Ligand binder design. Structure first.
Ligand SMILES: N[C@H]1CCN(S(=O)(=O)c2ccccc2)C1
Length: 460
């Protein structure tokens, strides 16, 4: 039985509005309704992995897992295995997988982050799940961010707290937050970003939705605008939105948006908005293709509609040679030439690099770089030809060209990371000097750039 080089992943996000679901929710898992929907011909084909994020979920874990497993059984005739379930207050994530994957899945981690302070600590935050699928690391984040049209800055703060403090994936990757720990990271939930148009325009917005004319609404979506200004979700992807706003509906129909201010809303307007979202970030040059992104039309127990997204995702096999694991492959080597970091920092400490990769026995520390002042005020840290030669555990090109090197640039004085990035080994050529580049981030904000040349030697 061959190991796969591709899997499909279903991502669902649903704010349930503290109501039990209806008897049938299969449309969600089939990616049927509005937007980019799944072909009828695929209906019986199970996804490899289903990841279900709920918010305002009133069910026990037992009650929800029964409903989910029943739904998938009815669609696929497959009894899915529970990989992980984790709940913080009424925020929940469930990961289900085909039984044939049970011995492909390992290193399962769960965590949560509670956002805010005092007044604003008690119901918002995130849950997450990570695991290895053969040689591929997968992370999943379900967040319920701060509500309200006038709190986009609070949402951006909630995002930074979640990516700083959610403890998933390989704890040895100590310089790296969740935005660097995974081959594929999916981040979804009730992110609560709103369409920023005047209150008086509510009926105009409703008209536009009835005409399926979303362009003048999406141009005011706070998540799109904050992402374009690099305020949140830097280096993440989102599929184009082609479905109606998923919030705020009258329950038991989808015919009416309930937007007017009420005592129940704290006298706040809820203009129709794309609150419910799926984003992803994969390592450079790894296959990831969104094959659906939409909302259901027939599940109406909540004031939100469910959102689905599905993906093709490249995966690699648990590689064994005669040498690695448990030793290196003399044939293999990674050389860095003419490398330099450009940092936005005002500090003047010396810096060194750490190279982290599951293709190395353990992480590699460089010598300190040579600081120079850049023309336009910047710090340039030069490494020249001084960087260590990295010795991968396996030299087979079918393995090594699929790997990635995480880079952290750390202060000699404090040993704190000033920037993190990732370099793909999926090169155009081996035994050849080739340009490499990554942006550097810290706490998910841009801090600099790393660039230079690489020379990769494989057994071929
Ligand atoms: N124990 C009972 C309670 C819920 N389940 S169920 O399997 O998820 C299910 C849900 C809706 C229709 C048919 C079956 C059966």
């Amino acid at each position: 039985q061959p190991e796969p080089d591709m899997i499909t992943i279903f991502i669902g996000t649903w704010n349930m509005g503290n109501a039990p679901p209806p008897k049938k929710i299969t449309s969600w898992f089939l990616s049927k309704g509005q937007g980019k929907t799944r072909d009828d011909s695929a209906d019986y084909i199970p996804h490899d992995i289903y990841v279900i994020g709920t918010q305002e979920d009133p069910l026990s874990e037992k009650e929800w897992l029964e409903i989910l497993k029943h739904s998938l059984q009815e669609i696929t005739s497959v009894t899915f295995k529970t990989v992980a379930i984790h709940t913080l207050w009424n925020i929940r994530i469930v990961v289900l997988a085909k039984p044939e994957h049970e011995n492909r899945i390992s290193h399962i981690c769960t965590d949560n982050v509670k956002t805010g302070i005092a007044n604003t600590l008690g119901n918002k935050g995130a849950v997450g799940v990570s695991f290895m699928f053969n040689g591929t690391s997968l992370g999943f984040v379900n967040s319920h961010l701060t509500s309200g049209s006038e709190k986009k800055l609070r949402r951006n703060q909630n995002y930074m707290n979640i990516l700083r403090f959610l403890a998933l994936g390989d704890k040895k990757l100590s310089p790296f937050n969740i935005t660097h720990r995974f081959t594929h990271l999916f981040w979804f939930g009730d992110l609560n970003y709103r369409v920023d148009l005047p209150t008086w325009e509510a009926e105009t917005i409703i008209q536009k939705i009835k005409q399926q004319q979303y362009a003048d609404l999406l141009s005011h979506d706070q998540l799109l605008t904050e992402r374009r200004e690099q305020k949140v979700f830097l280096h993440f992807e989102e599929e184009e939105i082609t479905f109606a706003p998923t919030y705020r509906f009258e329950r038991l129909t989808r015919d009416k948006y309930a937007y007017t201010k009420q005592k129940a809303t704290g006298m706040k307007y809820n203009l129709p908005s794309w609150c419910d979202r799926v984003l992803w970030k994969s390592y450079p040059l790894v296959h990831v293709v969104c094959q659906s992104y939409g909302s259901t039309s027939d599940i109406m127990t909540s004031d939100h509609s469910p959102v689905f997204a599905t993906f093709e995702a490249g995966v690699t096999s648990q590689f064994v040679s005669k040498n690695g694991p448990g030793t290196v492959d003399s044939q293999g080597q990674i050389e860095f030439l003419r490398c330099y970091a450009t940092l936005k920092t005002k500090s003047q400490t010396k810096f060194y690099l750490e190279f982290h990769s599951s293709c190395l026995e353990s992480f590699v520390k460089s010598q300190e770089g040579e600081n120079e002042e850049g023309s336009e005020g910047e710090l340039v840290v030069k490494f020249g030809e001084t960087l260590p030669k990295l010795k991968p555990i396996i030299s087979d090109p079918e393995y090594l060209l699929d790997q990635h090197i995480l880079i952290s640039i750390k202060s000699s004085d404090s040993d704190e990371s000033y920037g993190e990035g990732c370099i793909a080994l999926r090169l155009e050529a081996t035994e050849t000097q080739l340009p490499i580049y990554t942006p550097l981030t810290h706490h998910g904000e841009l801090t600099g750039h790393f660039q230079g040349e690489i020379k990769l030697q494989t057994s071929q």
